[PDB]
């Protein structure tokens, strides 16, 4: 039905502003909603931080005290977020979601887009394969694994086989240590099937636009 | 500004089985009109959160019939009539009655599953990685049950408690299990000094650790 999707920069420099964008398709932004953006930070808190709604009126949470801007551009239906002055402290996924005036249904809400506030430079990762012991390999099932190395910021995405390899899988939350994230996934498959049917784990990095497609070789000959 | 408190904060409920959760407000969330602004949401792992019920007691749009929310006033609740995994997750209450609107702090769902142990698997640094001048040994700790598990790195023998950093999964629904990542970071030149490396599991399951080895520089 609604559907949001919000968009903007990913690494923001302390002291500057946070400027986010929601698309919104299969609605009007000028009919029936209110357009909320909402924060999440660690440990499951929530943060209400402002609407504007289907005409125009807006309203925001006063912990931001006047760092706050909600607009909208009617012409290209999408709302907008701007907040100043940001710290660390407002490092949090951002989501847009809108909410019907008349009685708080029909919540929609987009993907979500994570805000990293830091002077920490953009890095791209190194992915390293990770190859089964031999002596790990003789069982009915074989794991393999990628690692994805120092990084900056969140996030990367990873697949399997281009996404085709999907059951199996689990890819873990990465690590910040010292500026630079390390994140690894593992794959699970019949053992019978490998290494005849290759995997390749399928890294990508937008912040540094870079993308790494590395194949998994088995240790020994190859 | 209104508070929402929920409890409990975590509830485990095996499938099939009923679940309650608590919301209470410190202030009536009624309005003018007759409407109360009270809806509860689910944010599944790795999502958004997403609508359940509204107006205190009326089904969201396309939410199934499993979902009921109940109550008045200052005092909310919903219940799952038969859990089941996919509703594994944290659930808010929110309220819109008062300005500035406010979620309560969440409650996590798990679900309960018969014990499981992990299945472990090490890995040694890739040549790739022994080029740049650090060498990351990984081991994977997956699908068990329950969640606590603690693990041991050893180098020749010996424990090293020094470099390792953990990972933990969310629940899965396809099988209601944990998983985790283990990995112990070393420069290349320390790597290469030393011979064999170990991660060993240890796990509700059996009072035996699960070892996982590997000597570096054979295959």
């Known amino acids: 039905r609604v559907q949001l999707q919000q968009s903007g920069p990913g690494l923001v420099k302390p002291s500057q502003s946070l400027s986010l964008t929601c698309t919104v398709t299969?609605?009007?932004?000028?009919?029936?909603?209110?357009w909320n953006w909402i924060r999440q930070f660690p440990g499951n808190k929530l943060e209400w931080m402002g609407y504007?709604?289907?005409?125009?009126?807006?309203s925001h949470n006063p912990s931001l005290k006047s760092r706050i801007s909600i607009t909208r551009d009617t012409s290209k239906n999408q709302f907008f977020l701007q907040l100043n002055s940001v710290t660390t402290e407002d490092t949090a996924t951002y989501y847009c979601a809108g909410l019907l005036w008349y009685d708080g249904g029909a919540g929609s809400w987009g993907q979500g887009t994570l805000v990293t506030v830091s002077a920490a430079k953009t890095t791209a990762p190194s992915v390293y394969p990770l190859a089964p012991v031999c002596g790990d390999t003789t069982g009915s099932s074989v794991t393999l694994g990628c690692l994805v190395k120092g990084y900056f910021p969140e996030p990367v995405t990873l697949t399997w086989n281009s996404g085709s390899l999907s059951s199996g899988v689990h890819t873990f939350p990465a690590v910040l240590q010292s500026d630079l994230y390390t994140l690894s996934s593992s794959v699970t498959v019949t053992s019978s099937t490998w290494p005849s049917q290759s995997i390749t784990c399928n890294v990508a990095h937008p912040a540094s636009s870079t993308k790494v497609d590395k194949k998994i070789e088995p240790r020994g000959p190859t | 500004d209104v508070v929402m408190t929920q409890s409990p904060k975590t509830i485990s409920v095996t499938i099939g089985q009923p679940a309650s959760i608590s919301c209470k407000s410190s202030q009536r969330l009624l309005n003018s009109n007759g409407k109360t602004f009270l809806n509860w949401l689910l944010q599944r792992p790795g999502q958004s959160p997403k609508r359940l019920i509204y107006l205190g007691t009326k089904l969201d749009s396309g939410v199934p019939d499993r979902f009921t929310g109940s109550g008045s006033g200052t005092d909310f609740t919903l219940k799952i009539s038969r859990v089941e995994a996919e509703d594994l997750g944290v659930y808010y209450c929110?309220?819109?009655?008062?300005?500035?609107?406010?979620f309560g702090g969440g409650t996590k769902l798990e679900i309960k599953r018969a014990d499981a142990a992990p299945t472990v698997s090490i890995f040694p640094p890739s040549s790739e990685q022994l080029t740049s001048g650090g060498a990351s040994v990984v081991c994977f700790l997956n699908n068990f049950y329950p969640k606590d598990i603690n693990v041991k790195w050893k180098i020749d023998g010996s424990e090293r408690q020094n470099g390792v950093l953990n990972s933990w999964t969310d629940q899965d629904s396809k099988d209601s299990t944990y998983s985790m990542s283990s990995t112990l970071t070393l420069t290349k030149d320390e790597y290469e000094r030393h011979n064999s490396y170990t991660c060993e599991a240890t796990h509700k399951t059996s009072t035996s650790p699960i070892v996982k080895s590997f000597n570096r520089n054979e295959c």
């Open positions: 929110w309220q819109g009655t008062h300005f500035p609107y406010t």
């Open positions: 299969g609605y009007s932004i000028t009919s029936d909603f209110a």
């Open positions: 504007i709604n289907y005409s125009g009126f807006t």
